[model samples]
Target chain A: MQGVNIYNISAGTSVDLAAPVTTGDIVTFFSSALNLNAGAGNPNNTTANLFAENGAYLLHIAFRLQENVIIFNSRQPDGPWLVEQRVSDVANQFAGIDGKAMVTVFDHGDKYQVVINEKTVIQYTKQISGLTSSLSYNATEETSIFSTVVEAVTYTGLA
Target chain B: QGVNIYNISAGTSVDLAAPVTTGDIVTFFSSALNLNAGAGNPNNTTANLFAENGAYLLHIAFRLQENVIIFNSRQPDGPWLVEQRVSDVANQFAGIDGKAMVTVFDHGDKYQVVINEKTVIQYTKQISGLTSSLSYNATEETSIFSTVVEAVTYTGLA
Candidate 1:
């Protein structure tokens, strides 16, 4: 069957160049922060569901892994939210030192790319059906003198 | 007379059996000396080198830098051979809340220390050749203290 390809239909609050996004399309996201700070919630939700189905989901966060902790949220627009993921160590597969990590989701051959700090850290090719939701980013605690900035997001169509 | 020995602790003085010349080397076993006052000032105590017959007496004085005393020896009357000194603010020898300085003296090719016992600052050095005069001072009267002499020996060289 032909895969679904979705593109960014609305200009979100981010200032970076908007990449073409579509349903069943691959999207990559990236960001940088002087110090780890709770990120602004996902801004592209009305048109794109980062977490589209329950089949399989991957999240990769790349940053200067400090002693502080970061919390991530995933939930469907309708309900059944998942528990927050606390990323504190650099030993996790999705974690790296001051570098990029890609979080990818695959369903029916559709791939998504979530890059961090200008590097492609997340990628997936397998398609998991019925996965449609918005992903949220945040830190567990308040931060001072730190700013987290999203750098880029890209998507590719798959069959 | 070679070298006259004095016990500041006992307030006594003793003469060496043999007299020491310019090339004679002498060693004294003395406890560590205190060179600091309670209020932190140079005691201004002066050390003197006297001839065996008590004929010629030369006064040896040294300036303290941030509670550090440097050794100054001289030729004929003043050769002024200064010793190496070091200080660290992190660690005080006398258990004070400020910086401490140290000097190292060589004892038979080995290093020994005479710390400012009040502030924990110590003097240490490896004994190599020969040294003539050693003196220290404190500004305040009660700031200076002393230790008893443990042993004394002389090497007939210089």
Candidate 2:
């Protein structure tokens, strides 16, 4: 699946995109992330869900993981999904002053490339079958952004 | 300063009330603004912003019960240069008394209007040309409300 392998899964709060997504397609998200701060005692966290169109599956994205500029992704939407890892030891994943987060996921035939703000967070070679999900954000830290999703045609440079 | 100045809870001409400074956060939320206004089609109420004199700039128009339109004009009498329709789904448009909010503020390089805290529209070069102004809508006659209860004052950003 190449060009037009794109599904605009936007406009659902939207907080969801505008299309139907299957395997082999790439989804990229952008939003003006605000108030996501990960520190020693700070509980700053933001979570988004990628739900199944069939109404039973989920994928999760979380930022500011445990005091570093980091994020995680998981196959579990039931539990505030986590692929928990440090994308950097340098600055917080919420490093940008405005905390802008750009998340790109490549649903490759072999593995899924999950990258955050130009940093590779994880690459899992597992099955993500039937991905009919809406991206919804839920956070306790005043984080507000109608996450933008762009489904791409090729998986050329998505890592 | 919190009470809405320009109100159409009841016509066409705008109710110009408060003055907004650049950094001052202007929050506009309608529990439900019926764009239809009685019995009309494509009718809308506009929160038009005009510079003290520089230009007419833009208008955030919510079509009665239907669409949200962003209009831009270069001058007071100039034609609205652009019209952007912001609607996502059917039966999902701004509903009556259904809550919708617009957070107006300027940060970084643009004038950004964050609607419902997620959908953002930025105008770095275009938004600031005006000093201040409004007139809520254009439907013949209906209630543009704050009609019953007041909304919020998010102090901690949550």
Stretches > 4 Å off in candidate 2: A1-159, B1-18, B33-43, B64-68, B89-97, B140-158
- Which regions in candidate 1 have their CA more than 4 angstroms from the true location? A1-24, A34-73, A78-80, A83-148, B1-158
Q: Write the per-residue lDDT of candidate 2 for residues A84-106, one digit (tens) a residue.
A: 44354324433443544455665
The CAPRI classification for model 1 reads as incorrect
Q: For all the candidates, what are their Cα RMSDs to the real structure?
A: 28.5, 13.8
Q: Could you report the DockQ of all the candidates, in the order they appear?
A: 0.00, 0.02
Q: Estimate each model's TM-score.
A: 0.25, 0.36
lDDT of 2 by residue, B1-158 (tens): 12232333323334234444443334454656443355324544455555676465556655546544454556666665656566632232333234444544433244455554243456544545423554444433543333421221111110
Error of 1 at A98 (Å): 3.4
Candidate 2: CAPRI quality band: incorrect
Q: Give the distance in Å from residue B76's predicted Cα in candidate 1 to where it truly belongs.
A: 86
For all candidates in order, the CA lDDT equals 0.32, 0.43
TM-score of chain A of 2: 0.56
True contacts kept of each: 0.00, 0.00
